[PDB]
Amino acid sequence: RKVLQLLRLTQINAGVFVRLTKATSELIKLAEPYVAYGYPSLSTIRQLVYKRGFGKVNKQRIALSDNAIIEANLGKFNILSIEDLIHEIYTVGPNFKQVSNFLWPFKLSNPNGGFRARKFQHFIQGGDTGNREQFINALVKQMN
Amino acid sequence: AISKNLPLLNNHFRKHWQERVRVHFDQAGKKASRRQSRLRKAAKIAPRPIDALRPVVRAPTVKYNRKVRAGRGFTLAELKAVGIAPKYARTIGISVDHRR
Amino acid sequence: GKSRGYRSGTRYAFQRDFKKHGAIPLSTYLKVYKVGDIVDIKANGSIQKGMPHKYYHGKTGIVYNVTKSSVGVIINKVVGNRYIEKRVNLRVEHVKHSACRQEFLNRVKSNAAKKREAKANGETVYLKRQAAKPRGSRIISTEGNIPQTLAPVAYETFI
Amino acid sequence: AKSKNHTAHNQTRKAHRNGIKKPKTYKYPSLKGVDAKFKRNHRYALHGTAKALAKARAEKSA
Amino acid sequence: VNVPKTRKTYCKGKECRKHTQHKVTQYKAGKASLFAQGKRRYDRKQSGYGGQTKQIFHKKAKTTKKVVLRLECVVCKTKAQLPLKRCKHFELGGDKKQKGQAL
Amino acid sequence: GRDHTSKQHVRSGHRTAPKSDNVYLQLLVKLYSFLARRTDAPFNKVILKSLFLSKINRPPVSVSRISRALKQKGAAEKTIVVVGTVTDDNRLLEFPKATIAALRFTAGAKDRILKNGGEAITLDQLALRAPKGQNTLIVRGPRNSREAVRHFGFGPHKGKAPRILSKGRKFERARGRRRSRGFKV
RNA sequence: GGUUGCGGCCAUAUCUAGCAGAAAGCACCGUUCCCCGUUCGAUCAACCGUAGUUAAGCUGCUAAGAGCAAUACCGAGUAGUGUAGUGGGAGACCAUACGCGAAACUAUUGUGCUGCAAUCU
RNA sequence: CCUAAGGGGGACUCAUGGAGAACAGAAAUCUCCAGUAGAACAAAAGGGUAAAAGUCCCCUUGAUUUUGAUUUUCAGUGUGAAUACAAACCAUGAAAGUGUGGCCUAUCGAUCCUUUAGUCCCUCGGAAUUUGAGGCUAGAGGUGCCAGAAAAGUUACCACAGGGAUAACUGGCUUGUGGCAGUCAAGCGUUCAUAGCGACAUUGCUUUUUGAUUCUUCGAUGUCGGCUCUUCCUAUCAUACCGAAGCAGAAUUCGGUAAGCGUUGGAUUGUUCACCCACUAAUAGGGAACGUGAGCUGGGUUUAGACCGUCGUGAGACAGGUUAGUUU
RNA sequence: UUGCUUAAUUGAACGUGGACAAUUGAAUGAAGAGCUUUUAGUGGGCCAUUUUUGGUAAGCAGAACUGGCGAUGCGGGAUGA
RNA sequence: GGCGAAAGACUAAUCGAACCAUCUAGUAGCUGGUUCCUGCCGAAGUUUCCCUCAGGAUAGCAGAAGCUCGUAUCAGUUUUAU
RNA sequence: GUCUAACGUCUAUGCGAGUGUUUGGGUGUAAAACCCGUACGCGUAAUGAAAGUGAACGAAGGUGGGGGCCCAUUAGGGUGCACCAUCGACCGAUCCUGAUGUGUUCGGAUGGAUUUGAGUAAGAGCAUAGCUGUUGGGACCCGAAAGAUGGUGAACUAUGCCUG
Ligand SMILES: CC(=O)O[C@@H]1[C@@H](O)[C@H](O[C@H]2[C@H](OC(=O)[C@H]3CC[C@@H]4[C@H](C3)O[C@@]3(C[C@H](OC(=O)/C=C/c5ccccc5)[C@H](C)CO3)[C@]43CO3)O[C@H](C)[C@@H](O)[C@@H]2OC(C)=O)O[C@H](C)[C@H]1O
Ligand SMILES: [Mg+2]
Ligand SMILES: [Mg+2]
Ligand SMILES: [Mg+2]
Ligand SMILES: [Mg+2]
Ligand SMILES: [Mg+2]
Ligand SMILES: [Mg+2]
Ligand SMILES: [Mg+2]
Ligand SMILES: [Mg+2]
Ligand SMILES: [Mg+2]
Ligand SMILES: [Mg+2]
Ligand SMILES: [Mg+2]
Ligand SMILES: [Mg+2]
Ligand SMILES: [Mg+2]
Ligand SMILES: [Mg+2]
Ligand SMILES: [Mg+2]
Ligand SMILES: [Mg+2]
Ligand SMILES: [Mg+2]
Ligand SMILES: [Mg+2]
Ligand SMILES: [Mg+2]
Ligand SMILES: [Mg+2]
Ligand SMILES: [Mg+2]
Ligand SMILES: [Mg+2]
Ligand SMILES: [Mg+2]
Ligand SMILES: [Mg+2]
Ligand SMILES: [Mg+2]
Ligand SMILES: [Mg+2]
Ligand SMILES: [Mg+2]
Ligand SMILES: [Mg+2]
Ligand SMILES: [Mg+2]
Ligand SMILES: [Mg+2]
Ligand SMILES: [Mg+2]
Ligand SMILES: [Mg+2]
Ligand SMILES: [Mg+2]
Ligand SMILES: [Mg+2]
Ligand SMILES: [Mg+2]
Ligand SMILES: [Mg+2]
Ligand SMILES: [Mg+2]
Ligand SMILES: [Mg+2]
Ligand SMILES: [Mg+2]
Ligand SMILES: [Mg+2]
Ligand SMILES: [Mg+2]
Ligand SMILES: [Mg+2]
Ligand SMILES: [Mg+2]
Ligand SMILES: [Mg+2]
Ligand SMILES: [Mg+2]
Ligand SMILES: [Mg+2]
Ligand SMILES: [Mg+2]
Ligand SMILES: [Mg+2]
Ligand SMILES: [Mg+2]
Ligand SMILES: [Mg+2]
Ligand SMILES: [Mg+2]
Ligand SMILES: [Mg+2]
Ligand SMILES: [Mg+2]
Ligand SMILES: [Mg+2]
Ligand SMILES: [Mg+2]
Ligand SMILES: [Mg+2]
Ligand SMILES: [Mg+2]
Ligand SMILES: [Mg+2]
Ligand SMILES: [Mg+2]
Ligand SMILES: [Mg+2]
Ligand SMILES: [Mg+2]
Ligand SMILES: [Mg+2]
Ligand SMILES: [Mg+2]
Ligand SMILES: [Mg+2]
Ligand SMILES: [Mg+2]
Ligand SMILES: [Mg+2]
Ligand SMILES: [Mg+2]
Ligand SMILES: [Mg+2]
Ligand SMILES: [Mg+2]
Ligand SMILES: [Mg+2]
Ligand SMILES: [Mg+2]
Ligand SMILES: [Mg+2]
Ligand SMILES: [Mg+2]
Ligand SMILES: [Mg+2]
Ligand SMILES: [Mg+2]
Ligand SMILES: [Mg+2]
Ligand SMILES: [Mg+2]
Ligand SMILES: [Mg+2]
Ligand SMILES: [Mg+2]
Ligand SMILES: [Mg+2]
Ligand SMILES: [Mg+2]
Ligand SMILES: [Mg+2]
Ligand SMILES: [Mg+2]
Ligand SMILES: [Mg+2]
Ligand SMILES: [Mg+2]
Ligand SMILES: [Mg+2]
Ligand SMILES: [Mg+2]
Ligand SMILES: [Mg+2]
Ligand SMILES: [Mg+2]
Ligand SMILES: [Mg+2]
Ligand SMILES: [Mg+2]
Ligand SMILES: [Mg+2]
Ligand SMILES: [Mg+2]
Ligand SMILES: [Mg+2]
Ligand SMILES: [Mg+2]
Ligand SMILES: [Mg+2]
Ligand SMILES: [Mg+2]
Ligand SMILES: [Mg+2]
Ligand SMILES: [Mg+2]
Ligand SMILES: [Mg+2]
Ligand SMILES: [Mg+2]
Ligand SMILES: [Mg+2]
Ligand SMILES: [Mg+2]
Ligand SMILES: [Mg+2]
Ligand SMILES: [Mg+2]
Ligand SMILES: [Mg+2]
Ligand SMILES: [Mg+2]
Ligand SMILES: [Mg+2]
Ligand SMILES: [Mg+2]
Ligand SMILES: [Mg+2]
Ligand SMILES: [Mg+2]
Ligand SMILES: [Mg+2]
Ligand SMILES: [Mg+2]
Ligand SMILES: [Mg+2]
Ligand SMILES: [Mg+2]
Ligand SMILES: [Mg+2]
Ligand SMILES: [Mg+2]
Ligand SMILES: [Mg+2]
Ligand SMILES: [Mg+2]
Ligand SMILES: [Mg+2]
Ligand SMILES: [Mg+2]
Ligand SMILES: [Mg+2]
Ligand SMILES: [Mg+2]
Ligand SMILES: [Mg+2]
Ligand SMILES: [Mg+2]
Ligand SMILES: [Mg+2]
Ligand SMILES: [Mg+2]
Ligand SMILES: [Mg+2]
Ligand SMILES: [Mg+2]
Ligand SMILES: [Mg+2]
Ligand SMILES: [Zn+2]
């Protein structure tokens, strides 16, 4: 529960970007029975940021509807555009932490087409939790 | 019966106290009647003053040595010094104290 | 009948190590403890004076007082919903310097040495530690290492 | 009658609503329990240190 | 329990302030005076009607008593008191142990 | 549903207005609500917060505190600001010439400030000669000197004052206060 | 490098059985007036360094040596275990998923290192 | 429990085994070697201890004084116990050191009152002296229900507040116990394991036994048995049709489908149960709130009267006997 | 600096002065951190997974950790804390 | 208290202590009940002591009032070292 | 779940090292309003059982922070109230030392101590009112089995007597 709170995953169908190391990998391992995760493609990142991209501005969830909001909040990190933000996320950049924490947790819908017959078992055993890797793109396509 | 960090009280209400409650609703009435009695006494004896002349005496104890107040009556020695007999003095508005 | 004495349940905790009973090696008595040192606490069962309570066996703390044969160590103990500062008087036989300080203290020196060297060369150096990162790409040579095919083996009984 | 004897159930839930707080650290710890002989002399050393610094600044000023 | 009739301990007397020789004696409680205020109050409370006015202890549990040593300094005659642990048996200046003897 | 990491619908826990219904204190809040909202001067934001404080949170400032604050190096001609009452101190031997702005002045305080060549002005008069609180020095009274604080945090070996109505040898001095009567805490 | 005195770590140093040991050192060794201690100058105390000896101590080497120490395409990713499922099975228990992961066994190697002072073919 | 079994120092090294020496042997005393503790350390057990903490010897009183800090139990209160220091005064040892009781973990006790010690100090209040009394500090006298009232019974003549927070019916889980049924087959059965049986084991079923529990009911579900009457189960006593035999017949035994159909009259007992007599095809076993009391009856149990025996000083008790006792 | 400590000019503690500047020394998060006063109800609990004790067992009794019911509706498990 | 050829029987439908009025609104850790709306927060059956075991006090959980400040340095989490 | 006596916290108000007119006196258009002052209560000194003694080494202390203010010019410096942590100083109690002196047993200078106080360390209180909480009171409402005091019954009935 604490691990999911520290990942800012405090509701169902909440999505977040994590840079893979050892500390964060052992974090996600602790939250593994409750999450579905994988490796997102560039088009998936773009679609997420374009449709459901929100920023944390004065602790408020603000739509990313203009590049001035991004510049005013991430120009000291050399992010001046929505594409700068997408690039910084995709090719994990020197300012991944600030850009991903500025991003409000993505609030996705349920999959169009549903889940598997039973969610709460590993993707390897025919469920939904754990690492699905390239099938995270299909799952996000279902849910975003 | 005992609870919290509170001072320990001494409320002496274990007898039939409610049968002996004196409420002074008549404070103003007694003030007014005292004034009326005072007017009656003044008109009774006018122009003779309503107050007898009282002496001045030191208050007893180490706490009231400094203060001086009105006594009860002039001593026999004091009346002797001004040539007034106590029996006569009591009839001319002078108070006498044989004890002091 | 319940039993809850001072050394209850310390049958194995306060035991000497196997083939390590007897006299105390004298480096224990030659070590020098200063106020502010970080020390591990481990009760020696053969010295019963100045012995810690069973709670402090295995705890690490700060020296605050130095006496003839003992040091005072400050321990923070959980009591309900907060910590209470505990002050335990321990003879130095139950105390050893904590090996954590020095790793920090060497990393401080290495950062200072690296920073001046980059400053000497007029370049920059990054001193923050990093968690282990995912490995990069690589090429596997197969000269002498052609892949060998394995299969699951059938079931056998060996009794 | 016979009742429940003991249980620690729900106690870690109550301790973590507002507690589990590490104690604050301060620059100067209290010297309570420190050796009296050291404490007695440490009083004289600090007083003399203040005098030396007071005189050095009194020199600077006038 | 065997305790010698002499002992050299610290003397709290202002003259001594040191270990001197002392005479060990068993302390004996003094006679209850009739004019102590508590015994004066007790006699008045019991008088008249009302019966027994203060409690009488019954539930004895101790089977021993704490022995108190009266140490009188031979130099300045200052007395001192020392309580011992609970002992059933106690002699003062008894025969010292003889180790090595036969049955 | 949400896994709440903090308590929901929690008021700030700070006064945003005076509890008093005095219309003239509201006028002062009216003035410093505008000043704090518009000057970027940290002085005006502090004054607005101090105008909300309750009586025990604005302890009286003696005329001796102002004298000691004016005796700081380079503070002799500063304007003393007290959001509360300034009381007199008959233990002072002398008082300087000073300008002091306060909510209230006692008769002795007003006499003493004016006797020594100073000024006793109100907080609205301050806002015109110092709308940003320039060259000012805020003085606050002792908060822990209150009598109620004597009994706060009472306990064994805590050294606080017991809540008691009478004082004497017969009142809470025997058992628990004396080693001859059992223990002492 | 050997040896002595004082040591640190406290068996890679211990234990058993053989063999060897130049120089110095150490040691055994000789004596009982004196200080001293004993049933006993055996231990302890003192004296001589004079009469003798490396026999022993000590040191080194040898042993498919015991023990100890270290290592591992040894056993074994086994036993166990944290986490998971509206998995199997009447049950006892078991399989699978994401992780952590022994002990015994087997084989090989090693058998004190070292600090201060003094001394020696 | 201990003036040492406390403290210091020194010397030595236990349990046990082997090999030897007059009486002497399994066990007396002496000698050597081996001997990591396999002993001893007051008392339970655990930990600890080998030029020692064990054994022996010498000297001692640190088992002393003033009080603070700290650890455990903990509210971070008390009590008990313990730890490291500060200031004294000592013991011991050549010394360094150690010693603030017992190698460590248990071995203990508030207010009020009394008593003793200390300070010989403060007070007895109009002022003094001396007795006496009262204060301050530290012990003891004790609360073992051990954070600490001062305390014998009976009620079947009984009362009240409540409780299904809790027993005495039914009901529910369980099935030890009770009852019933299987398998494996060493044996029994003149031969012959299984016509009929079947040990040692082991798997089950049942809730007509008794336990275990206390979930429901204590502002009450009328607690035994019988009589009367209906229905249901089958683990079938009889009656129908069949299979098997160590079935010649007759008789008898085991089994299958089977609860359609019946399963009695009496002596004694309140009895359920039992036992006897007798008829019969048979006189099977059970359930339905241990069916069935606004159906009855009221013999039993279990109010109040009374007798006896045993118990009790007694009032009274008996799950012992006896008699009389409102069934709306 | 000291009255503590050393044979000491040795140390102990607390200091004056100087050097090391934002990669000021891991991650992630942070409706911010810290502090105070005062007072309610409660002080019968129970259940599920796992660890686990007594018992033949129990819808039995008793513990450990967590999550629940109690205090809670909604969809499913027909029905059911 | 009476009275009892004795049942704790009778003493005005009242008897193992009559009836009447008062003390008395006797006390009750035990029953029952406890009266309008919406909004926000939101428990405990656990620690210690108690002739304590159906109750209290105490700490904990909770509300309210706020106060000093504004990223300062915190966390029912991970990494590295020990 | 009330009213009252006495209280804790918090808040508002008046005055403030003081505060409180209401016991009382004056006055009145008469239980109102208005006016008056001595005392007294609380506070402004504590500590000790008591006899008693009784709060500045210093800018009313030092150190690290500290909002705000001043000088700057990222940064930096100065000043830093409240408040926090820490080390000190002063007063009372306890213990130690014990000067000139003296009703020769008194006095207690001076210098100290891991002790101790509900203290000082440029006052903060008093009064009125309100909610909440406490205690005594019938005490949120209704409820015992009992106890006591003083009286009324032998027209039923028990027993004695008298007369039928
Ligand atoms: C003699 C008999 O059988 O009964 C005696 C009775 O006579 C005695 O009464 C004494 C009486 O006791 C009391 O007043 C109480 C005071 C203290 C309480 C209690 C007695 O003693 C306790 C209990 C225990 O102390 C005792 O037990 C003391 C007994 C004692 C005996 C005689 C004198 C003094 C004390 C604690 C240590 C504290 O003191 C106490 C706290 O509970 O005091 C009078 C002054 C004495 O004269 C009177 O003595 C006589 C002999 O008459 O009380 C004892 C408790 C009884 O056992
Ligand atoms: Mg993130
Ligand atoms: Mg569709
Ligand atoms: Mg589908
Ligand atoms: Mg799908
Ligand atoms: Mg599909
Ligand atoms: Mg589905
Ligand atoms: Mg499905
Ligand atoms: Mg969609
Ligand atoms: Mg037992
Ligand atoms: Mg036990
Ligand atoms: Mg261990
Ligand atoms: Mg000891
Ligand atoms: Mg300890
Ligand atoms: Mg850099
Ligand atoms: Mg009970
Ligand atoms: Mg139960
Ligand atoms: Mg309970
Ligand atoms: Mg003496
Ligand atoms: Mg009297
Ligand atoms: Mg008499
Ligand atoms: Mg009497
Ligand atoms: Mg005060
Ligand atoms: Mg070499
Ligand atoms: Mg030679
Ligand atoms: Mg010899
Ligand atoms: Mg010799
Ligand atoms: Mg040799
Ligand atoms: Mg040789
Ligand atoms: Mg080998
Ligand atoms: Mg597993
Ligand atoms: Mg599971
Ligand atoms: Mg399924
Ligand atoms: Mg695995
Ligand atoms: Mg011993
Ligand atoms: Mg000894
Ligand atoms: Mg000894
Ligand atoms: Mg020895
Ligand atoms: Mg003793
Ligand atoms: Mg306790
Ligand atoms: Mg304690
Ligand atoms: Mg505590
Ligand atoms: Mg404590
Ligand atoms: Mg204690
Ligand atoms: Mg000593
Ligand atoms: Mg006692
Ligand atoms: Mg008198
Ligand atoms: Mg006395
Ligand atoms: Mg005193
Ligand atoms: Mg006592
Ligand atoms: Mg008790
Ligand atoms: Mg008790
Ligand atoms: Mg009793
Ligand atoms: Mg009877
Ligand atoms: Mg009976
Ligand atoms: Mg029940
Ligand atoms: Mg069965
Ligand atoms: Mg059976
Ligand atoms: Mg049953
Ligand atoms: Mg039942
Ligand atoms: Mg019932
Ligand atoms: Mg009913
Ligand atoms: Mg019933
Ligand atoms: Mg019925
Ligand atoms: Mg019945
Ligand atoms: Mg059948
Ligand atoms: Mg039929
Ligand atoms: Mg019959
Ligand atoms: Mg019959
Ligand atoms: Mg029978
Ligand atoms: Mg029934
Ligand atoms: Mg039945
Ligand atoms: Mg029935
Ligand atoms: Mg039935
Ligand atoms: Mg019926
Ligand atoms: Mg009937
Ligand atoms: Mg019947
Ligand atoms: Mg009947
Ligand atoms: Mg009958
Ligand atoms: Mg019968
Ligand atoms: Mg009867
Ligand atoms: Mg009899
Ligand atoms: Mg009977
Ligand atoms: Mg019988
Ligand atoms: Mg009859
Ligand atoms: Mg510096
Ligand atoms: Mg790291
Ligand atoms: Mg509360
Ligand atoms: Mg509370
Ligand atoms: Mg409470
Ligand atoms: Mg409460
Ligand atoms: Mg319950
Ligand atoms: Mg309850
Ligand atoms: Mg669950
Ligand atoms: Mg499971
Ligand atoms: Mg249970
Ligand atoms: Mg409930
Ligand atoms: Mg729910
Ligand atoms: Mg539903
Ligand atoms: Mg449902
Ligand atoms: Mg179902
Ligand atoms: Mg009478
Ligand atoms: Mg009479
Ligand atoms: Mg009778
Ligand atoms: Mg009658
Ligand atoms: Mg009548
Ligand atoms: Mg009647
Ligand atoms: Mg009648
Ligand atoms: Mg109760
Ligand atoms: Mg809520
Ligand atoms: Mg409570
Ligand atoms: Mg708790
Ligand atoms: Mg709170
Ligand atoms: Mg912080
Ligand atoms: Mg590690
Ligand atoms: Mg008036
Ligand atoms: Mg009038
Ligand atoms: Mg006054
Ligand atoms: Mg002289
Ligand atoms: Mg003289
Ligand atoms: Mg003199
Ligand atoms: Mg003089
Ligand atoms: Mg103090
Ligand atoms: Mg102050
Ligand atoms: Mg003050
Ligand atoms: Mg009532
Ligand atoms: Mg009330
Ligand atoms: Mg009330
Ligand atoms: Mg009533
Ligand atoms: Mg009574
Ligand atoms: Mg008649
Ligand atoms: Zn003496």
**What percent of chain F is helix, strand and coil (3-state, nearest 5)?**
30, 15, 55
> Can you tell me the distance from the alpha carbon of F65 to that of E37, in angstroms, rounded to the nearest whole number?
56
Best mutation target, D26, D35, D39, D42, to test chain C (most C CBs within 10 A): D35
| F126 SS3 class | helix
- State which nucleotides on strand J lie below 7 Å from a protein beta carbon: 24, 40-47, 53-54, 56-63, 65-70, 74-82
Which pairs count as long-range contacts for C68-72, CB under 8 Å and 24+ apart, including other chains?
C71/C33, C71/C39, C71/C95, C72/D33, C72/D34
CA dihedral sign, ordered A116, A120, A121, A124: positive
| A124 SS3 class | helix
Distance C23 CA to ligand 30 centre (A): 29
- State which nucleotides on strand H lie below 7 Å from a protein beta carbon: 1-5, 46-51, 53, 56-57, 60-66, 68-73, 75-80, 83-91, 98-99, 101-120, 132-145, 149-152, 165-166, 214
Residue A96 belongs to what H/E stretch?
helix A96-102
To the question of whether residue E47 is assigned a binding role by annotation, the answer is: yes
- If we measure between CA atoms, which residue out of B56, B58, B55 comes closest to residue B94? B55
Q: Calculate the CA dihedral of residues A56, A60, A63, A64 and round it to 10 degrees.
A: -30
- Residue A57: exposed, middle, or buried by beta-carbon count in 10 A (0-12, 13-18, 19+)? middle
> Can you tell me the distance from the alpha carbon of E8 to that of E18, in angstroms, rounded to the nearest whole number?
9
Helix ranges restricted to H, chain E: 37-46
DSSP letter at E97? P
Q: What angle do CA F119, F123, F124 make, to 5 degrees?
A: 105
Cβ-count burial B31-64 (b if 16+ within 10 Å, e if not)? eeeeeeeeeeeeeeeeeeeeeeeebeeeeeeeee
Inter-residue contact A144 to A52 (CB < 8 Å):
yes
CA dihedral sign, ordered F85, F90, F91, F92: positive
Q: What are phi and psi of F143, to 5 degrees?
A: -90, -35
Inter-residue contact C14 to C45 (CB < 8 Å):
yes
Inter-residue contact F140 to F68 (CB < 8 Å):
no
Other CB atoms within 10 A of residue A135 CB: 13
The ligand placed nearest to the CA atom of residue C8 is 11
F5 to chain A, any CB pair closer than 8 A? The answer is yes
- Residue F137: exposed, middle, or buried by beta-carbon count in 10 A (0-12, 13-18, 19+)? middle
> Can you tell me the distance from the alpha carbon of C55 to that of C75, in angstroms, rounded to the nearest whole number?
10
> Can you tell me the distance from the alpha carbon of A134 to that of A141, in angstroms, rounded to the nearest whole number?
12
- If we measure between CA atoms, which residue out of A8, A3, A11, A15 comes closest to residue A89? A15
Residues with CB under 6 A from ligand 1: E 32, 38-39, 42, 54, 56-57
